[PDB]
Design a protein around this ligand. Structure first.
Ligand code: AKG
Ligand code: FE2
Length: 323
């Protein structure tokens, strides 16, 4: 689903100007300011966000286009490293992630990931691991983000400050609401609520005492007629023949309903991380200081088990595997 936000530029530049200029120095206060300001989002944008939050969509994403972004010459050099400096001045697309994110829920960091920070720069780096956001020339395969984590976030949000030079990197999304009807009833029933072994991403590795301790992911779960999805092409590891066959049918169906989005400066993509898998196609970095640059945050909501009380936007949570 898409919303053209161009006509909102003046109002959104104003809301961004309400926010602290050095977000990370007091991230709790920054995100509280963003929550207050989110009450003043333009009405039709607020409606689109609240509708998507409550209901999702058939295509599993909400793309906001034409948000105020700095001119390319007015941005810093694309980052080369992580974590970001705590003193880094606010970027307009970060302000947008604050406002839009707090309209939806609570920004969440993961202790073991990206030094326990909340805002993540997504840029290409040489020598990237094949599952990393740092990849460029190799396809980043379909994944639900952190499907294996008990505190998996409801949304992944990606805001673009720079696209890659040739605008060849496409962000791919595949929605369970489009894939499910392509599956037959026997496949749906095998997948639904069935725990399967799932490896974890690099950041979360170690301390796995025995095969008992391996994370368990239900590739479909919840209401049989409108299930949630948990899928990771590389990390999900079904063991019985009937499980491998059912996951292969799911994989095929997700490919057949793939949608491609080319993120450009000013775009903010909201992925329904309980109903959709995402991926990124190849591109060739130039190592020139102007490579592709996204900002990523994770948002928790009241849906399903994410929150148990007292959480704040900006909290950083520890790892517990699903079981
Ligand atoms: O680079 C992209 O478009 C998406 C990368 C991604 O999967 C993520 O940052 O979670
Ligand atoms: Fe991702």
């Amino acid at each position: 689903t898409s919303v053209d936000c161009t006509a909102y530029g003046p109002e959104l530049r104003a809301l961004a100007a309400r926010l602290p200029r050095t977000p990370r120095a007091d991230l709790y206060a920054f995100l509280d300011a963003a929550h207050t300001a989110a009450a003043s989002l333009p009405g039709a944008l607020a409606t689109a966000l609240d509708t998507f939050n409550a209901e999702g969509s058939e295509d599993g994403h909400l793309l906001l286009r034409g948000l105020p972004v700095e001119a390319d010459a007015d941005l810093p050099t694309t980052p080369s490293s992580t974590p970001a400096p705590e003193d880094r001045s606010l970027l307009t697309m970060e302000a947008m992630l604050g406002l839009v994110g707090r309209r939806l829920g609570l920004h969440t960091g993961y202790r073991e990931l990206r030094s326990g920070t909340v805002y993540h720069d997504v840029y290409p780096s040489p020598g990237a691991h094949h599952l990393s956001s740092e990849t460029s020339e190799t396809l980043l395969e379909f994944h639900t983000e952190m499907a294996y984590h008990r505190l998996q976030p409801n949304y992944v949000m990606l805001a673009c400050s720079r696209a890659d030079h040739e605008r060849t990197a496409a962000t791919l999304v595949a929605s369970v609401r489009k894939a499910l009807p392509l599956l037959d009833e026997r496949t749906r029933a095998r997948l639904l609520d069935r725990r399967m072994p799932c490896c974890v991403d690099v950041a979360f590795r170690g301390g796995v005492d025995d095969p008992g301790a391996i994370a368990q992911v239900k590739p479909l779960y919840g209401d049989a007629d409108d299930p949630f999805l948990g899928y990771d092409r590389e990390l999900l590891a079904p063991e019985d023949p009937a499980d491998k066959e059912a996951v292969a049918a799911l994989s095929k169906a997700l490919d057949e309903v793939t949608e491609a989005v080319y993120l450009e400066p000013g775009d903010l993509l909201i992925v329904d991380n309980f109903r959709t898998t995402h991926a990124r196609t190849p591109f060739s970095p130039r190592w020139d200081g102007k490579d592709r640059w996204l900002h990523r945050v994770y948002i928790r909501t009241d849906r399903n088990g994410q929150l148990s009380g007292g959480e704040r936007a900006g909290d950083v949570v520890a790892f517990t595997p699903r079981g």
